[PDB]
Amino acid sequence: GEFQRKLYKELVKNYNPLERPVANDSQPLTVYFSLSLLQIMDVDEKNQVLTTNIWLQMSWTDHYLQWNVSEYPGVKTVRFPDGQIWKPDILLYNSADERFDATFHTNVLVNSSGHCQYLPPGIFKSSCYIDVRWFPFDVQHCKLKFGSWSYGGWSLDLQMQEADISGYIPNGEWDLVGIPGKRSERFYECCKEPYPDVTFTVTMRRRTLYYGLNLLIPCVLISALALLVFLLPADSGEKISLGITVLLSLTVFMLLVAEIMPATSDSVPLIAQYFASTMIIVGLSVVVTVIVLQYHHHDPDGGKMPKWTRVILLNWCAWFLRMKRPGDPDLAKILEEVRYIANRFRCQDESEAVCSEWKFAACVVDRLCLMAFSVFTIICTIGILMSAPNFVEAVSKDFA
Amino acid sequence: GEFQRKLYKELVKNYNPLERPVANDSQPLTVYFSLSLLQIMDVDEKNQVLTTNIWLQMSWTDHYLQWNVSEYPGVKTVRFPDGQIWKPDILLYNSADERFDATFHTNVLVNSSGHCQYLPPGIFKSSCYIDVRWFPFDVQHCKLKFGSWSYGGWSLDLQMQEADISGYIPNGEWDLVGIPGKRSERFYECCKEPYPDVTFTVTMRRRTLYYGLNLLIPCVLISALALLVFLLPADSGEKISLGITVLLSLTVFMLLVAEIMPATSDSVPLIAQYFASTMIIVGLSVVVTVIVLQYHHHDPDGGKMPKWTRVILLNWCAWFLRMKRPGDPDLAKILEEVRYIANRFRCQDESEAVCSEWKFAACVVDRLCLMAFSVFTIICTIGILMSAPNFVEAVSKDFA
Amino acid sequence: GEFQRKLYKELVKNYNPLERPVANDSQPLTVYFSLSLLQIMDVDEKNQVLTTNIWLQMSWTDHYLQWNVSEYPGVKTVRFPDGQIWKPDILLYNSADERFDATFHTNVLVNSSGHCQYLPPGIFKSSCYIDVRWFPFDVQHCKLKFGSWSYGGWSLDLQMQEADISGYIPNGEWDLVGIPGKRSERFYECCKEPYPDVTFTVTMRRRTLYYGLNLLIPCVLISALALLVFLLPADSGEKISLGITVLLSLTVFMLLVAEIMPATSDSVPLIAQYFASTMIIVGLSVVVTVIVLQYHHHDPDGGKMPKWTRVILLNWCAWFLRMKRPGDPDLAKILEEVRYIANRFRCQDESEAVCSEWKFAACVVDRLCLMAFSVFTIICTIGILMSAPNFVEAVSKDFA
Amino acid sequence: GEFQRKLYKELVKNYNPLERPVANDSQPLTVYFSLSLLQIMDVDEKNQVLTTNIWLQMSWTDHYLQWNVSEYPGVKTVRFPDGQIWKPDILLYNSADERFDATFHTNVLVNSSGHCQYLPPGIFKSSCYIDVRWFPFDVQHCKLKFGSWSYGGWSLDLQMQEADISGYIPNGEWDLVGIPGKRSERFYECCKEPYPDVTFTVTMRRRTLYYGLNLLIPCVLISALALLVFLLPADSGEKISLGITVLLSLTVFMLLVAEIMPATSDSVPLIAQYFASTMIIVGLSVVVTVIVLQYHHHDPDGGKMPKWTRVILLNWCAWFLRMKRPGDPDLAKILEEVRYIANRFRCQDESEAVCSEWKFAACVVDRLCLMAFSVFTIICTIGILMSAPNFVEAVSKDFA
Amino acid sequence: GEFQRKLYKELVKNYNPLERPVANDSQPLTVYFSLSLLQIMDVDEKNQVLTTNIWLQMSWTDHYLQWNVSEYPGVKTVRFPDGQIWKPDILLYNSADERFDATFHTNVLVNSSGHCQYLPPGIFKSSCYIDVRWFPFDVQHCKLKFGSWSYGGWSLDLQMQEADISGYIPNGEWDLVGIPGKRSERFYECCKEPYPDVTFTVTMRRRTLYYGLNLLIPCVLISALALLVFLLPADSGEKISLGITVLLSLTVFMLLVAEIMPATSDSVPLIAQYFASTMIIVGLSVVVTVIVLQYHHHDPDGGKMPKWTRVILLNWCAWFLRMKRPGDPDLAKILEEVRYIANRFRCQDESEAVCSEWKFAACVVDRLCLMAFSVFTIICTIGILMSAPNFVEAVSKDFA
Numbered sequence A, B, C, D, E: 001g002e003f004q005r006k007l008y009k010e011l012v013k014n015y016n017p018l019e020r021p022v023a024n025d026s027q028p029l030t031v032y033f034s035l036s037l038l039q040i041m042d043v044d045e046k047n048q049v050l051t052t053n054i055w056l057q058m059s060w061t062d063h064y065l066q067w068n069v070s071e072y073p074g075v076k077t078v079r080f081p082d083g084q085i086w087k088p089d090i091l092l093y094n095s096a097d098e099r100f101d102a103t104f105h106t107n108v109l110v111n112s113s114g115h116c117q118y119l120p121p122g123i124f125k126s127s128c129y130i131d132v133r134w135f136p137f138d139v140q141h142c143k144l145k146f147g148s149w150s151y152g153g154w155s156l157d158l159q160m161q162e163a164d165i166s167g168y169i170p171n172g173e174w175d176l177v178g179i180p181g182k183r184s185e186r187f188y189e190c191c192k193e194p195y196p197d198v199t200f201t202v203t204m205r206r207r208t209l210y211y212g213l214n215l216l217i218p219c220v221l222i223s224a225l226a227l228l229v230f231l232l233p234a235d236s237g238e239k240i241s242l243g244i245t246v247l248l249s250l251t252v253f254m255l256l257v258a259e260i261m262p263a264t265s266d267s268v269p270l271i272a273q274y275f276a277s278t279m280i281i282v283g284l285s286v287v288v289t290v291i292v293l294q295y296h297h298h299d300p301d302g303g304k305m306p307k308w309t310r311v312i313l314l315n316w317c318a319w320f321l322r323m324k325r326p327g328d329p330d331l332a333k334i335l336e337e338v339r340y341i342a343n344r345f346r347c348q349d350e351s352e353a354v355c356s357e358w359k360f361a362a363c364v365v366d367r368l369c370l371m372a373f374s375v376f377t378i379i380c381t382i383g384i385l386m387s388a389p390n391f392v393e394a395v396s397k398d399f400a
């Protein structure tokens, strides 16, 4: 259009993109800043990097870019590319990307009175502290700090507007709680002029269904199966294998959790405490199994049963767990031989009785330790999994 | 030639690559948008990112790029590179690339009457929701939203043309169903003017031959092998090893599945349900094996077989399974000696008879549990596999 | 130099890089396009992407870039950088890269008669189909498609020159069979305008020495070792651990092999078929071992051994296998006692004889199944490995 | 603003960005170089690179960019982008990045008296030596070197300012000790002109809590558990499975841990020494277990007990460990029968006595080696772990 | 200053950066090319690339960039950025990075007489053959090729200067032997002109301490531990589990090791063949163990030991290793009864006396195969380890 061509020719006369567009040079240029959250794309726990998809919103008033629509009837707005008009240099101080600025530079929409609009999209990789103390029942607060880089507080009056979440797409792993913001001005060692900035905090809660189904339940089941050694008879000759195999099979779970966790030294993760407790339980299970095995394969006439062992394992625990304790010269020569044979059988009977009593003691010890270990593992698991805050909320929101 | 040089000099005279090429400024500009799918690069289930290879197609009429063929006999079309003529700022809204734009800028072919064609190729990484509820017999819909960033509905009339699939190359893992399009207008918090956009939906059906033959069949085979613990005689003393080793060998499969699957908590994957069911099956098998072994190694004199247990197992289940139940003074001194020996032998015979009864009871329990576990695992696996929709279609389209 | 400075000043006078350097504007400009292969870098089977080091070759005649050597002594060639002259817009069609054009823009060498040479280097990532049916005895063909993006047939006709492989460097993993091409031609539905393009097919053969020595021989050896369970006597007590451990090893081997293979569902690969056959063989061996162990530990009084099993195992297969089958009143009181003892001893002897007969039957079954399984595994391995059409060529080239 | 428009127009008049802003051309331009540390993002031990977030700080004086604020009341500072002003070419010498200069070019703030202030941000990847001799108890010294690439000391003399640590964000893994600066002058063979440069040495101390919890304690506990084979009785038939599975688990642990450390060959790391010691201890325990099992299953008449081992073990070692050492004509024919039976039983009991002797000797050897290995493991672990120069500091600052 | 401003204005008067700065247009421009190695960043065996930190030294004489130093006092050198003056187009021929040329474009220093120095830094990823045959005792020779892309001997004749290693920083894994250069020509068929090229070969020796300690010593120790299977008595019942567990562990060891090596089919690597030999050693040990177990459990009532075995396994082989060979009517009825019992005992003793011979034969085989397998393992390990060249040099330089 001829009007469009004339307006574009007239709007660029003696225009310097290096100057701040203010009618008076002694007042700051008010700029309104806001962002629109679109998607939380990634939360890296190991590298402590948060990846989001946002649209920055910048608005200000330009004094030289004004015209009367009477002389230009058809055209009401004008768009300008990068490098042709003045734009604020607003960056992200918290950036964690090789290019310190990740914004696709689009056009600038202008009023017929000089109201510039800037909506640059882009995927932002910011570095925020990730707390894994109560993993996987944790809520994270990651900050996004925005502000002008080279304009002080006397030339650029930054003003914050509320973030817009009307186009937010659920992540499916993180539940968004909110995104407040606040404006503050700081002093830097470079200069003696305040530099206002706008900080947005993103609060999200991890959904625990997947982790609960894939890490907590299998460990519970395997630890429960590890108690099955306290039910096998000692004569089966398989007791050590169960404990060893369950220890081996939980080593891989420990290694997996270690590989998915950041190498932080600020606190002990709740899952780490759980796995250490389970390791301890299995270790003492194996120790008790060895003790029972060495009690059951006792050598008759190899020692004397201590009186304390006798009383404690035959009159107290047997009662408490309702145990039931099991229970012419030729003729002369013939007689000598038959008494010898009978005496040999009698000694065999005494030896087998001693062996039976030793085996009964081993069985009593085994059952008592079974009960104690079951109580201990239930208590430890319940306490560890209930210690974390908002665990009831997480359960009621995800599972039920 | 001279005519080409003259035309090129004439066309760029007083041309502003900023203004919209419309004869009347009030009327909008009609731009036809279309897509040409070529290939599907990858479908990142873990990162919810879809990579494609497409050719965008745009067409519009330029008012100033017109000439007469008679005055320039040789030439009929001209081509302009980026930054020399006006082009629409159409870009993909749902972009997962580090840079928000992935198009490769090429030339713009021009009619003799002002028709511009623009076909920029590129590889697009668009973030689309991936549903793994019915993995691997699943169908995924991914959207591609294209629209002008800075031009409203009063300036650009973004029409839609049907997507073209003729140069499409089959992926070999995904089966294309179709790619329809739909145009709509939306309002944004920035501005009081609608912004039309064109959305293309891609429907792909996963081919399940590889995933089936690599995950389902081995798991079924190992689950069936885990039932052999009920055919092993108890005297071999190697029942528990089979169960614990198949438990390990399926835990590694669970690890692989956790590796390939994402970490969403929206739903429980079908493969996760199947693996959990197999886990419970093997755990219950190990528990039953422990019970059977503790039945087999029953200490005689250490207890009495309950009458209810006998009537349940010995003469009821054996009937059900049709199993047979197995089975001068000197001469005096010698007389009591041989009497003592004979009495000892008789007591040994009674003890071995009791032990044989206990062993038969253990065998009966083993047979019952074998039958029950076999029927239960068959029913569970059939139900879980057949619960998925279009499972029969996927089978008949892949295996047949 | 004075002369070359004057020539450079003169040549760029009234020059328009947008203009096509022809003399009549109606006759298409002939461009000769060829290739120069340097090295094959990587063949990504998982991503279906081929990376190569390639030098392009272009040659056209420029009408305006001519001069008389006699007027400019010494100056015989001139060179121009990107953008200062006209260049064909030839780029890879089936490219797989974030930035579509993977070329380095060097200078253009122009002779005194207007002949332009252009050799842009670069590393090209191309998405080509990768068949995996006969992996690792496979030969792959990957296609490279070039051609002008915008210039048609009446303006720019493409001519082919033979590909150059003089500078080729051996890969060490792929054997270059050759690289032919075809100068195709295409017509549209509007106009009789031939659109030409040049395509190059790279045919390579995989060297099988590494894959063979690292996959096939270890698996064959381990499968052969898995057959030793049949030679193991039942009384040892380790007939199940051997089979289950080789099963674990085979499962790990499949898991590690499937990490380098594509997830295509086009066809079942040869290596997958071989692994499936090995798994079936091992599972059947475990089942047979369970049956043999069940036979070995048979209750002497648990039943009667069927006459069919008698006349088969102890009669036919035993002869076939050439196995030898092993095999005053007080005086009356003492008489009764010794008769009782003797009767007990005789019953023990009969039970021992029955157990020995059962054990011999188990041994016969074990040996027969050993022979059958050895034949099965040898036949299956030979048949699976001999099905590759390139197997003889591979074994004659790589190994020999 | 009119005043700033006029000032911008007047300042760029006859200005050449290629010219060094001095007044005599023979005096070096004083430049002050500092550095503001934000956070340490990564320390890659495998690649030996360090990633940090750093704000550069350069300040100098410009002779031409001077104006009187009386004629321009509102204007007090001006800003210029890259390419329109002279900037020092300060680079990172020991950089490790695809682009040798990973800085973001921002505006240059200029005061009214010609004072410049340039603060470009960025993420820097520098190659620094990583010493893993005392891993995980490490203190690292990574150096950053800066300096003009082309400007010499006679034209550009760098000056060092103290590094600023305000605004530092704690890593959570690495503890920052400090970052001291040093300005060094290096001469050439040309001429007596300095070539000053500024170097900063970042000193970090690894926080040894995560590694201590995940590697040292689990391996210590597993090594302690591996000693339980000595308390296991030899009759259980599990004295080797425990040791072999512990050895397998520990070698898996070592091989997986090896994925973290680099392949350097300048020293033997502490963790490698500790793992090797554990390997040796477990192997020797397995050897001793084999020897003990050989002692236990000795043939009753396959040999004779040597006097030397008899006196050394049964006499001296029992004293040490305080172990109690356990333990009508037919009448003639009947006489030889009963005498034969009696002497057979006597031979059986003497063979049993010899077997008991061998078993007791095996038990004594087992106890002695248990004591020896219990001493050895503790001594080796303490000695290896106490060799770190800062072990006490690390423990007292990470645990207490 | 004024003088340098005037000089900068004067030098760019009628300057064309597209022409060689010669004075006759026929004499080639002599260009000196050198190198400055700083660090070897990484050597990749998988993808066969070499990444280094390198400074490129260039120097030539410019005819136009000259001035009288008297007329411009104080000014001695001038600097020009990329694009403002002519620069040689020298680039790496055999590159491996995505951008074919990776050099940071810095300024060019020009003296008063017209001498140009150009030292662009960068990180170069080359592509060189990596010989893995003698792994990990490799000595590599990676070539770097440099040269003008378009200019030839008529225009630009390259020269060579010795590479600079004064700034070298040791890698820690690779020992640098040296880096020699060479200047070579290449005559074309058309034109008898030189085509100078300068190539540098970097020779590095791998440090074997880490690889030895982490791969060779553990493998030898594990093989020695597996060698203990022959000392274990057969009565334990653990002779198979130990061997199979070691086999599985070392198989996973080899599979893990194979990941850090390329799939090159040009030679069989030393580590690969060593692991193979260990594989056959362990497999044969398992086979021998199976044979020994079969001999130990021979049926006493089965076949008869052949005379060949009776001599060779009992006399000859026991002499070879010196193992001593271990070794009224009622009266009639009672007489017949005791005769029967004594005859049964005598038959039992005779039957048992045959199993001792089989057990001694098993012991003889165990000892013989222990000796033979130990000798075989020692010989094979020594031969494979010492076969590689410069093994003595490597061990002396690394371990001492």
Ligand SMILES: *[C@@H]1O[C@H](CO)[C@@H](O[C@@H]2O[C@H](CO)[C@@H](O)[C@H](O)[C@H]2NC(C)=O)[C@H](O)[C@H]1NC(C)=O
Pocket: D111, D112, D113, D115
């Ligand atoms: C413009 O900015 C510079 C910042 O360095 C000012 O220089 C400093 O000014 C203060 C007070 O005048 C002095 O105390 C410092 O010593 C100065 N720094 C140096 C390195 O000299 C400069 O004064 C400012 N000029 C104007 C007109 O405001």
Ligand SMILES: CN1CCC[C@H]1c1cccnc1
Pocket: A055, A109, A117, A118, A119, B148, B149, B150, B188, B190, B191, B195
């Ligand atoms: C539709 N566009 C994309 C998002 C907002 C909107 C817009 C409006 C004005 C300037 N830029 C962008």
